[PDB]
Ligand binder design. Structure first.
Ligand SMILES: *[C@@H]1O[C@H](CO)[C@@H](O[C@@H]2O[C@H](CO)[C@@H](O)[C@H](O)[C@H]2NC(C)=O)[C@H](O)[C@H]1NC(C)=O
Ligand SMILES: *[C@@H]1O[C@H](CO)[C@@H](O)[C@H](O)[C@H]1NC(C)=O
Ligand code: NA
Lengths: 32, 592
């Protein structure tokens, strides 16, 4: 395979997680 | 009963608890519903242990018979202590370091021990979650990467170690871990392991960024999904041929096993971990409830669900063990039939083989019992047994995704508890400026425990994890749990505690609670503590190694740990147990 499937899944999962963290950090700042 | 003065004007009064909740609306978190609190507690109790430890012990320690010691200790130590932990937390309105420090200033070591234990357990357990999510990432492909051996460079045949071993065993020891031959041989950091380690710590920060406030929404799926998936697996497993054969195997009674000091030690150390006691997240989670919540009915419901879940997951695991053994057995007999058919140019069926066969030919004798007795305990069951069984099922890559999201959810719910146990005590020590937001502290714990977990991404990193996993729990949890029950009965006073409970629940604990808090539970916690130093001398501290270049390579090879390992066992099992006396000697000679 041109790209390892595990890396592409890893890619998409890490993506969502960090976009999760960004928003949560900002929602809390708004709460302040 | 022990003379501790100044206890009032160090804890809130009962008169002042009706007014404390309309002012801790600010500056203290509060569950959104009771279900949320109930789930978070369930997720903490129900964990990976109920998958690759409890089902194994159930059979090894007398199938069906193990229920006797498990259920005895469950109602005589589990429920009794779980209640003591829910009540004291809801009454004192603080976490674990808060409660013990308030009961007596020298009891702070108890809180320190619980925090240290939580850290040590969470460090290796998230590493296991890192391995779970490695497999899940490789679970989106028609041919599961643990389905076939990699070809030799000449492609003449399969890789030697895979050839001598199994594609599954090869995928775990060589392509996941890249394991070493010893704990003294350590290499570099397996980069892919570190990526997954990053993923694990990051997934846990996002759920625990703002404490229970963020973990409440998470437990709605993290504590529910596993039950749905566990159910879907039960209907699938029972359908598979060979299941029921492995249920029968789990529940065959060997009473002689009950008459063993090693049976009750495991049954004893299993109840404490299954209930996540002496970790001091359950005390912190109970402190957020209203002062008048029924914590007697919550301890009975949690403990009922815990004892039903334990058996229910054992039925799911031994359905797979029985299908996987029924598959190998049929494969073996097929090979033996083929040998006779090919050698004697023979038709031959299991029904007519022995009769049919009756020197050059070799028949590999195989018994279902031997295949069933191939069930192991600890990761191996998931990374070897299940991963293998799933490749021989239709829609292989969908049963792999569902099995590794389930284990992910189990692990993650357990991590919510362990993290509650490390952060809360840090806020009560006031290590960081109180002005700092909660996110900062939780982010420095998640980053500091991530950097220590690089030891388990070394090539020897599975040998280190199998050592910590055998010492992180046990002694510390047993001693910590014995002193929490002692400190709540002989130092705070069981008479003030009954009055307090009458205050919130409206009535006093019955004779059952009185009998087990004072005489039974503690007494039952001393004979488990004496069993530990009775079995320890037989441990020999020997660890299994892979060592591909070893005679009978695929066969188990146990080697003694290096002498320096004793230092490690002293530090991970002793320091979290000697801070309870250690702080109490320091405080009694700082005053004098
Ligand atoms: C039932 O349990 C007993 C007790 O563990 C088993 O007998 C043990 O067998 C091992 C292996 O030979 C010995 O090392 C132990 O000393 C034995 N214990 C006793 C008390 O005799 C017995 O084999 C078990 N039976 C089955 C069918 O599993
Ligand atoms: C681990 O694998 C790498 C290549 O991925 C190799 O350099 C190293 O020798 C392996 N470790 C052991 C102990 O064989
Ligand atoms: Na869990």
């Amino acid at each position: 395979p041109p790209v390892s499937i595990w890396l592409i899944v890893f890619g998409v999962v890490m993506g969502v997680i960090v976009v999760g963290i960004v928003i949560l950090i900002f929602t809390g700042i708004r709460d302040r | 009963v022990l003379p501790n003065p100044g206890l009032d004007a160090r804890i809130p009064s009962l008169a002042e608890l009706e007014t404390i909740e309309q002012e801790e609306a600010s500056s203290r978190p509060k569950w959104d519903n009771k279900a949320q609190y109930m789930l978070t507690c369930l997720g903490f109790c129900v964990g990976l242990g109920n998958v690759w430890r409890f089902p194994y012990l159930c059979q090894s320690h007398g199938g069906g018979a193990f229920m006797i010691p498990f259920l005895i200790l469950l109602v005589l130590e589990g429920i009794p202590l779980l209640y003591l932990e829910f009540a004291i937390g809801q009454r004192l309105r603080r976490g674990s370091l808060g409660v013990w420090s308030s009961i007596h200033p020298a009891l702070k070591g108890l809180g320190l021990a619980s925090m240290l234990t939580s850290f040590m357990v969470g460090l290796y357990y998230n590493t296991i979650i890192s391995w779970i999510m490695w497999y899940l990432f490789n679970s989106f492909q028609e041919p599961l990467p643990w389905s076939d051996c990699p070809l030799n460079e000449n492609q003449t045949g399969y890789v030697d170690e895979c050839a001598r071993s199994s594609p599954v065993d090869y995928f775990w020891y060589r392509e996941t871990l890249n394991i070493s031959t010893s704990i003294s041989d350590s290499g570099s950091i397996q980069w892919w392991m570190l990526l997954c380690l990053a993923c694990a710590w990051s997934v846990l920060y996002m759920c625990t960024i703002r404490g229970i406030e963020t973990t409440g929404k998470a437990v709605y799926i993290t504590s529910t999904l596993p039950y749905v998936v566990l159910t879907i697996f039960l209907i699938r497993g029972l359908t598979l041929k060979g299941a029921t054969n492995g249920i029968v195997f789990l529940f065959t009674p060997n009473v002689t096993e009950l008459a063993q000091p090693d049976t009750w030690l495991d049954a004893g150390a299993q109840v404490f971990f299954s209930f996540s006691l002496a970790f001091g997240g359950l005390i912190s989670f109970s402190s957020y409830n209203s002062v008048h919540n029924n914590c007697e009915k919550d301890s009975v419901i949690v403990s009922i669900i815990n004892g039903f879940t334990s058996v229910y997951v054992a039925i799911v695991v031994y359905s797979v063990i029985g299908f996987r053994a029924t598959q190998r057995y049929d494969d073996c007999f097929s090979t033996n039939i083929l040998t006779l058919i090919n050698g004697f140019d023979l038709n031959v069926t299991q029904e007519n083989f022995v009769d049919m066969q009756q020197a050059q030919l070799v028949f590999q004798t195989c018994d279902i019992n031997a295949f069933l007795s191939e069930a192991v305990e600890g990761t191996g069951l998931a990374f070897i047994v299940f991963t293998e069984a799933i490749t021989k099922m239709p829609l292989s890559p969908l049963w792999s995704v569902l099995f590794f999201i389930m284990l992910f959810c189990l692990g993650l719910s357990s991590m919510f508890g362990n993290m509650e146990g490390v952060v809360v005590p840090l806020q009560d020590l006031r290590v960081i400026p109180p002005k700092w937001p909660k996110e900062v502290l939780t982010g420095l714990i998640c980053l500091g425990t991530f950097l220590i977990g690089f030891i388990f991404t070394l090539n020897s990193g599975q040998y280190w994890l199998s050592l910590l996993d055998s010492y992180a729990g046990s002694i510390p949890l047993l001693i910590i749990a014995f002193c929490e029950m002692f400190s709540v009965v002989y130092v705070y006073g069981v008479d003030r505690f009954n009055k307090d409970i009458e205050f919130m629940i409206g009535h006093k604990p019955n004779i059952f609670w009185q009998v087990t808090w004072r005489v039974v539970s503690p007494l039952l916690m001393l004979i488990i503590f004496l069993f530990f130093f009775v079995v320890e001398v037989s441990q020999e501290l020997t660890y299994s190694i892979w060592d591909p270049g070893y005679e009978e390579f695929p066969k188990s090879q146990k080697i003694s740990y290096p002498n320096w390992v004793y230092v490690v066992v002293v530090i991970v099992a002793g320091v979290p147990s000697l801070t309870i006396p250690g702080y109490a000697i320091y405080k009694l000679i700082r005053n004098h």
